């Protein structure tokens, strides 16, 4: 489809077992924000955002609800037909140029995710790491698959080595994208 701008307003996803749902809005391909179903509020992608024009979080709960419904109904109607896992494909690259000592963020782009349940984690020197780590809500792919991104804020090091750990029911054994500064 052709267009100058494209907004995804209310893109809702639900699945079970697990009763796991998601509600998000994207414009021109980016995560405007998502809705935290527990704390029940509007959670943006950037601070600078909803600092003026907000969104009534209930509105989302209302599509997740509708979906829980539509979900069941369809499960049955399709003769309890299960969704087929896929092989998520990740790729790693830096937000900005690589300069030792200079901050930067490592990025892991995992595509073809689905079902929308995956486990991405980072790894420095074959050891797991936490914090400096942000994760985007699952994002819709044209072929109704998903892509997400994990950011690892860090600092180059002549030595240091990093890997993006990707787990999914769609992979017998975990996938690992390696990356380090030349």
């Amino acid at each position: 489809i052709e267009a100058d701008h494209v907004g995804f307003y209310g893109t809702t996803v639900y699945q079970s077992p697990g009763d796991i749902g998601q509600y998000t809005h994207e414009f021109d391909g980016d995560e405007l924000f998502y809705v935290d179903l527990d704390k029940k509020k509007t959670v943006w992608r950037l601070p600078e955002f909803g600092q003026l024009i907000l969104f009534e979080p209930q509105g989302g709960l209302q599509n997740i609800a509708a979906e829980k419904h539509n979900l069941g109904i369809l499960t049955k109607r399709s003769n309890f037909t299960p969704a087929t896992n896929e092989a998520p494909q990740a790729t790693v690259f830096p937000k900005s140029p690589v300069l030792l000592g200079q901050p930067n963020t490592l990025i892991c782009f995992v595509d073809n995710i689905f079902p929308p349940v995956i486990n991405i984690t980072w790894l420095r020197n074959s050891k797991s790491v936490t914090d400096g780590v942000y994760e985007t809500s699952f994002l819709v792919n044209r072929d109704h698959s998903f892509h997400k991104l994990s950011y690892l804020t860090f600092i180059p090091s002549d030595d240091d080595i990093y890997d993006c750990k990707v787990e999914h029911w769609g992979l017998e054994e975990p996938v690992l994208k390696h990356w380090e500064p030349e």
């Binding site: 307003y9 893109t11 369809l74 079902p115 929308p116």
Partner: peptide
Amino acid sequence: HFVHQFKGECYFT
């Protein structure tokens, strides 16, 4: 596993 989605798209030219 079972999944259902709902997509709402607005196109502007």
